[PDB]
Structure formats: C-alpha cells, structure tokens
Curated annotation (Swiss-Prot), chain B:
Note: Present with 5630 molecules/cell in log phase SD medium.
Record flagged with keyword Lipid metabolism: no
Underlying gene: BUD20
Single GO term (MF): ribosomal large subunit binding
Protein name (database record): Bud site selection protein 20
GO cellular component, one term: nucleus
Species the sequence originates in: Saccharomyces cerevisiae (strain ATCC 204508 / S288c) (Baker's yeast)
Shown stretch of the complete protein: 1 to 131 of 166
Phylogenetic placement of the source organism: Eukaryota, Fungi, Dikarya, Ascomycota, Saccharomycotina
Subunit and interaction comment: Associates with pre-60S ribosomal particles; released from the pre-60S particle very early in the cytoplasm.
From Swiss-Prot, chain D:
GO CC terms: cytosol; cytosolic large ribosomal subunit
Subcellular location: Cytoplasm
Organism: Saccharomyces cerevisiae (strain ATCC 204508 / S288c) (Baker's yeast)
Keywords from the UniProt entry: Cytoplasm, Ribonucleoprotein, Ribosomal protein
Main location: cytoplasm
Organism taxonomic ancestry: Eukaryota, Fungi, Dikarya, Ascomycota, Saccharomycotina
GO molecular function, one term: structural constituent of ribosome
UniProt miscellaneous comment: Present with 60400 molecules/cell in log phase SD medium.
Family under the similarity heading: Belongs to the eukaryotic ribosomal protein eL22 family.
Function text: Component of the ribosome, a large ribonucleoprotein complex responsible for the synthesis of proteins in the cell. The small ribosomal subunit (SSU) binds messenger RNAs (mRNAs) and translates the encoded message by selecting cognate aminoacyl-transfer RNA (tRNA) molecules. The large subunit (LSU) contains the ribosomal catalytic site termed the peptidyl transferase center (PTC), which catalyzes the formation of peptide bonds, thereby polymerizing the amino acids delivered by tRNAs into a polypeptide chain.
Encoding gene (name): RPL22A
GO-annotated biological processes: cytoplasmic translation
Protein name: Large ribosomal subunit protein eL22A
From Swiss-Prot, chain E:
UniProt key word Ribosomal protein: yes
Entry similarity comment: Belongs to the eukaryotic ribosomal protein eL39 family.
Self-association and partners: Component of the large ribosomal subunit (LSU). Mature yeast ribosomes consist of a small (40S) and a large (60S) subunit. The 40S small subunit contains 1 molecule of ribosomal RNA (18S rRNA) and 33 different proteins (encoded by 57 genes). The large 60S subunit contains 3 rRNA molecules (25S, 5.8S and 5S rRNA) and 46 different proteins (encoded by 81 genes). eL39 interacts with YIH1.
Locations listed in the record: Cytoplasm
Keyword check for Aminoacyl-tRNA synthetase: no
Protein name listed in UniProt: Large ribosomal subunit protein eL39
Curated annotation (Swiss-Prot), chain F:
Quaternary structure, from the entry: Component of the large ribosomal subunit (LSU). Mature yeast ribosomes consist of a small (40S) and a large (60S) subunit. The 40S small subunit contains 1 molecule of ribosomal RNA (18S rRNA) and 33 different proteins (encoded by 57 genes). The large 60S subunit contains 3 rRNA molecules (25S, 5.8S and 5S rRNA) and 46 different proteins (encoded by 81 genes). eL19 lies in close proximity to the binding site for eukaryotic initiation factor eIF4G.
Miscellaneous comment as given in the Swiss-Prot or TrEMBL entry: Present with 97700 molecules/cell in log phase SD medium. There are 2 genes for eL19 in yeast.
Cross-link (Glycyl lysine isopeptide (Lys-Gly) (interchain with G-Cter in ubiquitin)): 20, 52, 59
Function: Component of the ribosome, a large ribonucleoprotein complex responsible for the synthesis of proteins in the cell. The small ribosomal subunit (SSU) binds messenger RNAs (mRNAs) and translates the encoded message by selecting cognate aminoacyl-transfer RNA (tRNA) molecules. The large subunit (LSU) contains the ribosomal catalytic site termed the peptidyl transferase center (PTC), which catalyzes the formation of peptide bonds, thereby polymerizing the amino acids delivered by tRNAs into a polypeptide chain.
Record-given protein name: Large ribosomal subunit protein eL19A
Subcellular location: Cytoplasm
RNA sequence: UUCAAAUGAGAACUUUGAAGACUGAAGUGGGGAAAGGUUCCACGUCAACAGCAGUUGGACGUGGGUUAGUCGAUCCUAAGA
RNA sequence: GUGAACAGCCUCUAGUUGAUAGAAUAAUGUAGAUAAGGGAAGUCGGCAAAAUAGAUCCGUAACUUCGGGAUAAGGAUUGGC
C-alpha cells in the first residue's frame, strides 16, 4: 500500500514545471467524498443528510420566460456584417431589400 | 574504451606494479641501492630524488618534498600495506594451492612484513632528515 | 461486447533503438496499437492520466513496462462509424513486474 | 519573556459529521509537539486539552500558529483527510477545521 | 512615428477614409461599368510614400 | 469557442501573466459571455477563473 | 512535442484543460527613437493570401478607439542656412 | 545558483511551444564521435584533427632600446569530511 501510494503521488504531482492548484479555490463532488469516506470506514449518514438538504434546497422552478422562450431563439434578424442596431453598414445601407 | 582511460593506461605508458614495489621495499639492500643511484642523464634530477613507493623520479628535492606532502603518495603508501596480490591469492580464491597461499601469507606476516615496515620507517626518517 | 481487462505492456522492446525526441509519442502510438490488437477496435482513446504516466520522465524517459486497464465499451453516437471503442487507463501499482492479464468484473 | 500564549482549535464541524476524533488529535499533538528540538519534552511548558469541540494549547516556549497548522496538517495527512478538511483562522490564535467546497450530487 | 505632424496625420486621415470597397448599390445602376475598386490600398502592399 | 480575449482580460484583471490564469473547462459558455472586465471580476469571484500559485524556486540547497 | 473535451461538414495546426520542454534578466520579458499608418480592439466571416492545412490570422467585411497649464513640439542658440 | 565574471550550464517573474507532416533506417553525403599495434611511413605542404588549457606553489635561457622577453621553458598539486 505504501509503494502504491508513492506511485499515485508521483503520477499526481508535477511540482518541477508548475504549482498545484489550491484546494481552497477548487471544488469537488459528493460522490467522490462519499466513496472516500466509505473507503476510510466512517459513517456517511450525516454527510448524506447534508447533501439531501442541499439537493432539496436546489430546486428548479419554471417561469414565464421558460414557458415562452424556453425553446425559441432569435426574435431579431441577424445582420450580414454583425452590426448593432444603430451601427452604419457602409456596404449594404444603399440596398434596402435582400433580393437585390 | 574511452579516450581518457586509453591514453592513460595504454600498454606503452605502463607503470611499475605494486608487488614489484613491495619486493623493492622489503629488503634494506634494495632500498639503499635505489637511494644511491648512478647519475643518469635520461632520468629527471640526474636519477636522484626517487620515490620508491610511487616509483617516480623528481627533478628537485623540493619537488620530492611536495610529493611526500601529498595525498597521491599517501594513497600509494596505503595501497602498499597488505598482501601484494600475487597469483597465489587468486589461485587459493578459486580453490587451488591453498596450503601454498596460507604459507605465503604466514611468511609475509612473520618475516617479510615487520622488516619491510622497519625499512619504510628508516626511509621516511632519512627523507625527513635530508629534506 | 462490453469488457474490461488489465494487461502489462512491454514498452522497452517496442521503443528499442528509437530516437530520443520520438520515444514518448511512439509509446503513445504503440499503446494504441496494443489496444487495437487486444480488442479489435480502430477507435482507441487514452486517458490524460495515462498520457501523464507516459510523459512523466520527459520525452526520452518512458518506463519499461506499463500496467494498463483497457475497457471496450459501446459508442453511443449515431454519427460514429464504429459501434465499439477502447478506453485505456493507467493502473498505478507498486511495480509493473510479475503481473498477468486479468479480467475486471464490471459493476 | 515567557508570557503564556493560548491557541484554540475548533473541530466541531468534522466531529459532528463523524470523520474526526478530537481525542486522537489531542494525543497526536501531545506526542508530536517539539520543545528545544525534541519530542516528549513538554514538562510544565506546553499543555494540550480538549473537550469534544475545542482543543486548547497553552504554551510558554516557542509555539506559533504556523507550527500548530503544520502539525494539524500532518495529522490530517496521516488520517487521509488532507484533501477534504483544512485549517482556517477565524481571529488571532483561534482556528477551525472546515470542509472544502462540495457540490451536492443531485 | 508617434510624434507626427498635422500634414502627415491629415494625409493619413484621407487615406483611411478612402480605404473601402465599392458600395453595393453602385453595381445596380444603369450602364454601370465599375465592378471593383481599382485604386484600393493596403498598408502591407503599396506604401503611400509620405 | 474562442476564449483568447477572456484569457487576456483575466490575466490583466488578476494582475498576473497569462501563464498563471486558469479557466474552468466546464463553464465554457459562461466564460464566452464575459466581454468586460467587470464580468471577468465576477467570474474570478465565483471561482470560474482561478489564479495559480507561483512555481517554487526553493533555496534550501543554497 | 503528446492526451482529453468543445466548436465545426471537415481538426497534426482553432479554444480550454491536462502534460513535456524552451528563451534563462547582454531574454523568445517590459518600454521607446527612426520608419510604417490603423497593422491596435470588438463583431461578423473564408472565395483569394498565410510555398501543408486551417473552423485560425498582421487576411476579407462592418465599426469602435488616441482627452494635457505641468509629457513633447512650440522658445533659445550650435556647426551651419 | 556555480563560477574571477553581463562567460558557459540550470532555475524564478514574464513570454513562447512557431518553422508541411507520417512511416522505414540501403548506398553516397552534411554535422558530430570512437578506435588494437606503429606514430607523419600520408601529402606539394602535419591541411584537418589530436594534444595543452582554470587556480596554487617551485622554477624560468639566449637576446635586449634595460622598459621587456615571460604564462618563456621545465616540475608538483587540486574531491569529501
Ligand atoms: Mg539505432
Ligand atoms: Mg540553451
Ligand atoms: Mg533552460
Ligand atoms: Mg497553403
Ligand atoms: Mg489583432
Ligand atoms: Mg480589418
Ligand atoms: Mg590508433
Ligand atoms: Mg614523407
Ligand atoms: Mg609518398
Ligand atoms: Mg621566445
Ligand atoms: Zn611517493
């Protein structure tokens, strides 16, 4: 187990070329947390309670915007040169219709 | 194989061997003969100032003194302490002439050893006095 | 057929005599060829952690033997030309010596 | 000179979640705090106590919060909690153990 | 140069305003024989020579 | 997608080089929406963009 | 130089992440003088050009951007005109 | 950092990873090395390579415009603790 941990640490670490990312800035997943705690042999009841509370707090409720524009797109003609509403188009301002 | 080892240990650039130097140091007469050499023009320092252990001539007495005050000479002296590794050592290591090798080692321990040590001490004090 | 096995690959005899700037890329290509030989799949995908294991000691410092976990799985996309593909993962062990081909039970 | 300095550590969140042992942590600190270059030399110098939520270290001989954090991180690595639990400071000489940011699985 | 004279900057401004392709409505005119801008200039093709 | 501008803006806002800026590879659309330094600051605050630590040059052997 | 994902009809060459390397402060870094004149930046975008490729570009199309009593010119004189 | 040192070599900050690619390893080349014994017998010609090289100590001729020649020549040493 000690030799295996040495090999895993060697494959993980690359300290000569760059630094390791900070854990205080990174975030990880509850599935990995649960499986690591299960490997360590702890009790996951409290952690599962916290995760269930977080999942029940994180709910998605539809609104009028989701009902009306959920699958729609555009609603405005895209310009040929990618210009704004009041931006002059040197090439195309003198031709009103798209056929011409 | 490499250039350094080739140009140092080429056959034509060979040096005197440890067993021969040990045999030279063993007897007082040989030490006296190597200390009192005829003046040879083909040797540095007219054949004088000759370190027997390193088998090396020096051009000057100060050169000999600086050589004695050096780690190379100390390394040679440390090498010349024990058995000089003749063919009998390898033969007995293989399992051949074991009694002959044991008798040789016993003779070295009893007779050759202390006399060679005393000759080395006399040579050391003579070099210290003359230098 | 979905399957998963563990192998030891001898990269030493596959990289014997290779120019130093090509050793790790040739190790990548040889591992792909190894997976194609053992699974019959033209589509072989290497894990980035496996790429790290290959490149750990620079461009010319590939290990003599590597312990690999090869999984033949199903290609779910319709636009893909092949129904199956191989996915190669590193098996970080104490040593890659004295190990035989084994089958991993998928749960 | 030798003014007593007190450092407090709050292990309440990992202890309540049940992946931490305050008594084991206090015993590790007792065994591994060095004085004048040697372990087990805490004679009337460093006192470590715990009550299930707070671990208190009162020292009069060359102890710092950086050293306490170093020893706590060594203990966390030994118990394989280095990737999940970190040592944070709330105010001067008062610290806590906090879990890293975890998103719910959903 | 960054520190330039007003005469140089004015000539640069005129060149910038001249740098354009044809308007599309020119091509639609009756008996139009102009099909491209034959005097177009780019900064890496023909130097203005002050 | 093309996040070259967002990487440059993140480097300028954080105050380090482009070599020290980490963009979350999962929030690609969220980064592509950020066309302003204010939006880049929001991304840095919520953790989509992270500043890496410096590569160590230890002096222990010295 | 390599791996994965994204984009895309199409990826050896685009983007992000993961790796291996290099310039090694007399730099492949950060600014300027002469010169160039918009090449700067954003959006759109691939017919021609980038002696392979290209979804990329100092390319093509449409625009945005250079704020001074104290920084310069402007003033002084030099060899000279 | 090593080192007398803006030398060479390695690293931090910053910046690049650009130059058509893939597969094999015949001859002949371009660039770089090694070689038993002999040691210029080669060639118009020691062309080219090899040998020497830092620092410390001993010591250093003819000649001379007395300032030099001179690092002349010729010898010994170098690590770690
Ligand atoms: Mg070969
Ligand atoms: Mg170099
Ligand atoms: Mg380097
Ligand atoms: Mg082309
Ligand atoms: Mg640009
Ligand atoms: Mg343009
Ligand atoms: Mg030879
Ligand atoms: Mg001849
Ligand atoms: Mg001849
Ligand atoms: Mg001379
Ligand atoms: Zn000697």
């Amino acid at each position: 187990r000690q030799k295996t941990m040495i090999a895993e640490a060697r494959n993980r670490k690359s300290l000569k070329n760059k630094a390791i990312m900070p854990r205080s800035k990174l975030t990880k997943s509850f599935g990995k947390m649960e499986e690591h705690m299960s490997t360590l042999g702890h009790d996951m009841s409290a952690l599962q309670d916290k995760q269930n509370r977080a999942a029940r707090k994180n709910r998605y409720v539809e609104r009028g915007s989701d009902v009306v524009f959920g699958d729609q797109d555009a609603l405005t003609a895209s310009t040929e040169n990618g210009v704004k509403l009041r931006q002059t188009d040197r090439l195309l301002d003198g031709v009103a219709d798209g056929s011409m | 194989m490499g250039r350094y080892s080739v140009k140092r240990y080429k056959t034509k650039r060979r040096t005197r061997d440890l067993d021969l130097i040990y045999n030279d140091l063993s007897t007082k007469e040989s030490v006296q003969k190597l200390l009192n050499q005829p003046l040879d023009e083909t040797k540095p320092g007219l054949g004088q100032h000759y370190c027997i252990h390193c088998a090396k001539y020096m051009e000057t007495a100060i050169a000999l003194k600086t050589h004695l005050k050096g780690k190379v000479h100390k390394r040679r002296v440390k090498e010349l302490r024990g058995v000089p590794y003749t063919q009998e050592v390898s033969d007995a290591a293989a399992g051949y002439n074991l009694n002959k090798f044991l008798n040789r080692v016993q003779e070295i321990t009893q007779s050759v050893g202390p006399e060679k040590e005393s000759n080395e001490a006399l040579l050391k004090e003579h070099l210290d006095s003359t230098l | 057929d979905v399957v998963t096995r563990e192998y030891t690959i001898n990269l030493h005899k596959r990289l014997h005599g290779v120019s130093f700037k090509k050793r790790a890329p040739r190790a990548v290509k040889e591992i792909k060829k190894f997976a194609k030989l053992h699974m019959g799949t033209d589509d072989v995908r290497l894990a980035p952690e496996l790429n790290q294991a290959i490149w750990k000691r620079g461009v010319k410092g590939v290990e003599y033997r590597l312990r690999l976990r090869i999984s033949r799985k199903r290609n779910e996309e319709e636009d893909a030309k092949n129904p199956l593909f191989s996915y190669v993962e590193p098996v970080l062990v104490a040593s890659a010596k004295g190990l035989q081909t084994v089958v991993v039970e998928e749960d | 000179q030798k003014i007593a300095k007190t450092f407090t550590v709050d292990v309440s969140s990992p202890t309540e979640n049940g992946v931490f042992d305050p008594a084991s942590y206090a015993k590790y600190l007792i065994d591994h705090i060095k004085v004048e270059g040697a372990v087990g030399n805490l004679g009337n110098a460093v006192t470590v106590t715990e009550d299930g939520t707070v671990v208190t270290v009162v020292s009069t001989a060359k102890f710092s919060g950086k050293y306490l954090k170093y020893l706590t991180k060594k203990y966390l690595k030994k118990n394989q909690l280095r990737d999940w639990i970190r040592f944070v400071s709330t105010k001067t000489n008062e610290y806590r153990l906090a879990f890293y940011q975890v998103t719910p699985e959903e | 140069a960054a520190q330039k004279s007003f005469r140089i900057k004015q000539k640069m401004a005129k060149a910038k305003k001249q740098n354009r392709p044809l308007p599309q409505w020119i091509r639609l005119r009756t008996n139009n024989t102009i099909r491209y801008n034959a005097k177009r200039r780019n900064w890496r093709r023909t130097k203005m020579n002050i | 997608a093309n996040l070259r501008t967002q990487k440059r803006l993140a480097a300028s806002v954080v105050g380090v080089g482009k070599r020290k800026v980490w963009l979350d590879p999962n929030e690609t659309s969220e980064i592509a929406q950020a066309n302003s330094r204010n939006a880049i600051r929001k991304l840095v605050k919520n953790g989509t963009i992270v500043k890496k630590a410096v590569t160590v040059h230890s002096k222990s052997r010295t």
